[PDB]
């Protein structure tokens, strides 16, 4: 029972918004290839089975554990118990499998799977209304956490909740059982501060997604006025340990240190697979996190 587990996530290989991006890498690549750097478990794609017999029949022989998967929340549109019938197919999956966390995000008004969007023209949620969609987002969290599971809220570029005032909005009308996932690369894309935002929300934290960003790529995002795709498809995204990368971890991983943080650290980096080799830069970002964990003092 290590503290501390390292996955992966599958659109380093094969994206789920732009299908084009990697279409050729088979399922069983990316999972020989996840296997073979040394991750523990690696998180749901679209390649995925969604059945617990089928989906263990690809991981297990891989040794690979199920970390989670993302489930879309549509709580500005949908009732709450619609909501709730929603995820639990999401639920039972995750429980068959051994998952102990559930990723959610609201994408009923994103755009990060619009190519033709600019990110500038991402949906703000009116002030007033951040209320009743916290009641709704823990009400689903208390649902969850009924079954064992708990949820994870993903920010994320291109949504409501994208800016660090925003995941702020997010954790005071949500609690006791609603989580952060703490996405460094998200995170500061959207302008915030990882170590300010760790510092914060520690406490709440249930999910790390080490994910790195290239200053010069999220800034030509910015300057010209790009799409989110656009900008993965230019390496916005990269992994720990590249020097093209502008994410300091080891503070933000001394601060889950600090407060004895327990679970997964994900590497979740899109990037096209043509150009920036999945196998290579997943590799030099496995190796480069645990030794960041090992100088933060959170992997003993
Ligand atoms: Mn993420």
Redesign the pocket.
Same mark, same amino acid.
């Given at each position: 029972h290590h503290m501390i587990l390292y996955g992966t996530?599958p659109i380093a290989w094969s994206n789920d918004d732009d299908r084009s991006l990697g279409a050729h890498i088979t399922l069983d690549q990316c999972l020989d290839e996840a296997a073979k750097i040394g991750f523990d478990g690696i998180e749901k794609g679209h390649k995925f089975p969604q059945e617990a017999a089928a989906l263990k029949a690809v991981l297990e022989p891989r040794g690979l554990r199920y970390v989670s998967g993302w489930h879309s929340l549509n709580l500005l549109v949908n009732s709450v118990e619609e909501e709730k019938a929603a995820m639990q197919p999401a639920l039972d999956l995750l429980k068959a499998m051994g998952s102990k966390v559930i990723?959610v995000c609201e994408t009923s008004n994103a755009i990060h799977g619009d190519n033709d969007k600019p990110l500038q023209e991402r949906p703000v949620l009116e002030d007033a209304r951040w209320e009743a969609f916290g009641l709704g987002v823990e009400a689903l969290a208390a649902h969850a956490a009924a079954q064992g599971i708990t949820l994870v809220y %993903?920010h994320?570029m291109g949504t409501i909740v994208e800016t660090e005032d925003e995941i702020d909005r997010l954790m005071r009308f949500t609690g006791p059982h609603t989580r952060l996932?703490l996405?460094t690369?998200?995170c500061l894309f959207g302008r915030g501060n990882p170590e300010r935002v760790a510092q914060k929300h520690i406490a709440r934290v249930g999910h790390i %997604?080490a994910?790195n960003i290239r200053r010069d790529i999220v800034q030509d995002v910015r300057d010209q006025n790009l799409s989110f795709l656009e900008g993965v498809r230019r390496g916005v995204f990269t992994v720990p340990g590249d020097t093209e990368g502008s994410v300091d971890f080891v503070p933000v991983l001394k601060i889950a240190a600090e407060h004895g943080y327990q679970g997964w650290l994900?590497i979740?980096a899109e990037q096209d697979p043509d150009v920036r080799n999945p196998f290579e830069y997943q590799s030099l970002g496995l190796k480069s996190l645990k030794a960041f964990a090992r100088e933060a003092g959170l992997d003993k």
């Open positions: 996530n990723i %993903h994320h996932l996405d690369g998200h %997604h994910k994900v979740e």
